Amino acid sequence: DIVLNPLGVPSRMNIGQILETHLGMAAKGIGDKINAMLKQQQEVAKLREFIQRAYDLGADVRQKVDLSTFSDEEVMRLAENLRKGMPIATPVFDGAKEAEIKELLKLGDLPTSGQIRLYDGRTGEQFERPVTVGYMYMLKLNHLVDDKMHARSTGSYSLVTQQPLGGKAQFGGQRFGEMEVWALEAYGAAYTLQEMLTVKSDDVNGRTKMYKNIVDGNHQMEPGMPESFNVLLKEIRSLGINIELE
């Protein structure tokens, strides 16, 4: 169901997922043995002969559960809830060792190494090496892609500065910060820099002329001074500092 990537283990040293994979494979092997013994509808004294053999395979385990004091109807309800796989607890720093995983994999007729010989889907050949296959508890996450995608052509310009707003719920364009203005200066692309300052964002007689030029079918730049510069002139001039052009 999922083909993950094996190059992420040695750079990060999370070898917990390989052991969790092997233990999940052992658990589902037991849970398919019980499903095969239930689909044949054999007995109830056979389930007590196997599930009891599955519940004590450690060395010094804490819990001791015996299915002698279980009635002949509660064992069927118990084995009905283990058809999808026997659940396994493994506490934090009191974990199950590597010998116990191999002692559990041999109960449900599984390979001790944990790797099987997978065939390809497209071409039908088999791979050279064996491939690790098991079960990993995969989560979903709240960073869905329907709430990240966003696009905007024109709309809802701001009040004072007359450059477009910010926010996906606000329907605003992305910010072309000075980290990108340096990167466009370095390429030498001056005509992409003159466009992304005046005619796309900040001019007032610039956007509504470029829109008519584009709809008319004539891509031609029409420049002008930005509106954010002759607000800076009015805010410097209000300090009693005469600033002009020539």
Binding site: V3, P6, L23
Partner: protein
């Protein structure tokens, strides 16, 4: 349920206040998808009461992160229930066990570059069998104010 847990899944589901736990013990008298009526045992009763506890589960509502909240019952009609059991599993609970995601087959091999730099290649039977399809509940509001005109 998670196949490989740490045994701490049982304590976090109960104490989080997201399930419906029984105060007194007894036999379940009536199970609906909304309410659960439990008949109290004899010795766990008080001498001026009628001895029925009624739990009203909360169906599809809105959380703060705009996800679902929904409590389904997990007991059947006419079965005994002791004190402190779990009668209704909430959003991510399963017979009183915390269960956040779902478990599925995993192979560790590079497959034509589609899992290149921590990418994941997902088969179609995860999409078909409705394993990861979540439910979101939004809230839209239209308010009619008073203008001067």
């Amino acid at each position: 349920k998670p196949l490989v847990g740490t045994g701490m899944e049982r304590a976090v589901a109960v104490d989080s206040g997201v399930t419906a736990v029984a105060k007194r013990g007894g036999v379940v008298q009536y199970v609906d998808a909304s309410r659960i009526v439990i008949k109290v045992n004899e010795d766990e009763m008080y001498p001026g009461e009628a001895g029925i506890d009624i739990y009203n589960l909360t169906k599809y509502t809105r959380s703060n992160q705009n996800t679902c909240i929904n409590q389904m019952p997990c007991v059947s009609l006419g079965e005994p229930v002791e004190r402190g059991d779990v009668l209704a599993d909430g959003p991510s609970t399963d017979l009183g066990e915390l269960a956040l995601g779902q478990n599925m087959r995993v192979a560790f091999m590079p497959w034509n570059g589609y899992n290149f730099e921590d990418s994941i290649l997902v088969s179609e039977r995860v999409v078909q069998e409705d394993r990861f399809t979540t439910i979101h509940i939004q809230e839209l509001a239209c308010v009619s104010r008073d203008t001067k005109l």
